[PDB]
Amino acid sequence: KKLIPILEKIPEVELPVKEITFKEKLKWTGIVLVLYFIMGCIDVYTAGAQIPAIFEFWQTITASRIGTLITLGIGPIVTAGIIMQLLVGSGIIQMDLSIPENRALFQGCQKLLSIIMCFVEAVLFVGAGAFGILTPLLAFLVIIQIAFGSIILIYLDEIVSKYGIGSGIGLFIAAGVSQTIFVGALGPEGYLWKFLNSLIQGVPNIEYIAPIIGTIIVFLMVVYAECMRVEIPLAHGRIKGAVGKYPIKFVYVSNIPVILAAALFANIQLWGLALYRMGIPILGHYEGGRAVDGIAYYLSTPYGLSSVISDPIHAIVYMIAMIITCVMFGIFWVETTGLDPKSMAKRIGSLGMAIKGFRKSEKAIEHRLKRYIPPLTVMSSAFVGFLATIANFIGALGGGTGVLLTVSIVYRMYEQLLREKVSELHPAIAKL
Amino acid sequence: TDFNQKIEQLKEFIEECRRVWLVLKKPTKDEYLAVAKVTALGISLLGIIGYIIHVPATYIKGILK
Amino acid sequence: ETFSKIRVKPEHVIGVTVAFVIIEAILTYGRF
């Protein structure tokens, strides 16, 4: 038995088995993209035109933009997914998805929670003093809009997910970061100018061009890392001699994973401040907006403009803190979904392409996989998480880490555009 | 006792990781630049579009605030 | 697949979104 009643009440998206042309998947995606950017232009209906700065920490991983119709962004969806991976991860609620049951259970369920976390975050946001005027009346109104905007995304994700290319989330995030860059550097109060102008003014300010560099450096770094692969020689498909040489995206393995680690921290700095100016200092003493002490403090990413040396210890902890959090969701990405050997089985078996090493059988390869995975999975994340973190010390526009995900998401998005440009020819090989 | 075991094991797994972090393919300049290119090219489109929409839509919010 | 007893065609969510925009886009701005 399960929460199937209300679960069946939660709408979904009509997936046509008709012809969805590449041109259409593309054009679709684009419409989503814009409604997004657009929503990021519209402020939330609120007389208190005065808002307490911003939370320079949540926006990036959340793909949000505080003060707008998407002030909560992907934040909920991520939160939700975080819990699931937590439960269905630490065995607390052991589930063998295999059957379309558990699979659609884990999912449907999470989806719901996403709407739950949709409002929770909303309230938590205003309750964290994200706007300043807690007019119980006005406050209520705001929350409404807020979480409802995030809802639209949840459904816009669904759309892209079944009518276009790539992924909503993935997109969305890349959508935000990219913009955050092109605008921050070149827009109105753009940095490139503030620097360029500062040159003309005759008082060359290295602080105006700085952040822009930070971003190049990161991008360059993050990309290098995104190139590394673990090549797995494959066994001749009945033929003989050296053949395959299958590579694996050693970084993009722990993608969704790190998205969750960073997002965890996102819900801590939010949940701490929230449960600060609305209770007891359980997590930490914020003051000044963000946190200046407590779990919160030790778990607040240092980036923004320039790296902070004036707190070595702070660095160390964070790093290690992130690192481990990454390992975690990685492992929890194992027990669940992730690359599941059961399947990859016959997939390499149909082609009869066992690993280069040896063993051309089902149970054979199946095994060699179940085994090699976990270390891969853990190594990857541990690394990424490191990179991501260090990518923040260095600090960059859009978000060291954000840039990362983006760069990846963007490339996994290029691939998507190709696997499509081709599938648009031989109407069949939709699995090779 | 078990504690000793687990300790013995993590040392093992961790070493299994070292193995993964070894079967790694450094990129080949040309290959590298490929990614870098496409990548940026993408962040560029996406970024731009958000600009085309944002910037101006703020020139408004601002000249009517 | 999904146990969503209800089916929603994307054209709607899109239009429903064009809704949120128009409403607040005017509900807020264009004061008076």
Would you give an account of this structure?
The complex is a heterotrimer of chains A (about 425), B (about 60) and C (about 30). Helices cover about 60% and strands about 0% of the residues of chain A. By secondary structure, chain A is mostly helical. In chain A, helix 4 crosses helix 10, helix 8 packs antiparallel against helix 9 and helix 12 packs antiparallel against helix 14. Chain B has a single domain, classed as Single alpha-helices involved in coiled-coils or other helix-helix interfaces (Up-down Bundle). Chain B contains 2 helices and no strands. The longest helix of chain B is centred in the last third of the chain and has 35 residues. The radius of gyration of chain C is 15 Å and the shape is rod-shaped. At the A-B interface, helix 2, helix 7, helix 9, helix 14 and helix 15 of A face helix 1 and helix 2 of B. It is classed as protein transport.
Task: Give Rg of chain B in angstroms.
Answer: 25 Å
One letter per element, helices H and strands E, the order of chain A comes to HHHHHHHHHHHHHHH
Structural class of chain A: mainly alpha
How many β-strand runs of chain A?
0
Helix-strand string of chain B: HH
Radius of gyration of chain A: 23 Å
Strand count, sense and barrel status of the largest sheet of chain B are: none
CATH topology of chain B: Single alpha-helices involved in coiled-coils or other helix-helix interfaces
Kindly identify the CATH topology of chain A.
Preprotein translocase SecY subunit
Summed up, the helix count of chain A is 15
Distance between the termini of chain B: 70 Å
- Tally of strands of chain B: 0
Distance between the termini of chain A: 37 Å
What is the name of the CATH superfamily of chain A? SecY subunit domain
What is the CATH architecture term of chain B?
A: Up-down Bundle
Whole-number count of domains of chain A: 1
Give the largest interface pair and sizes. A-B, 47 and 36 residues
Largest sheet of chain A: none
What's the number of domains of chain B? 1
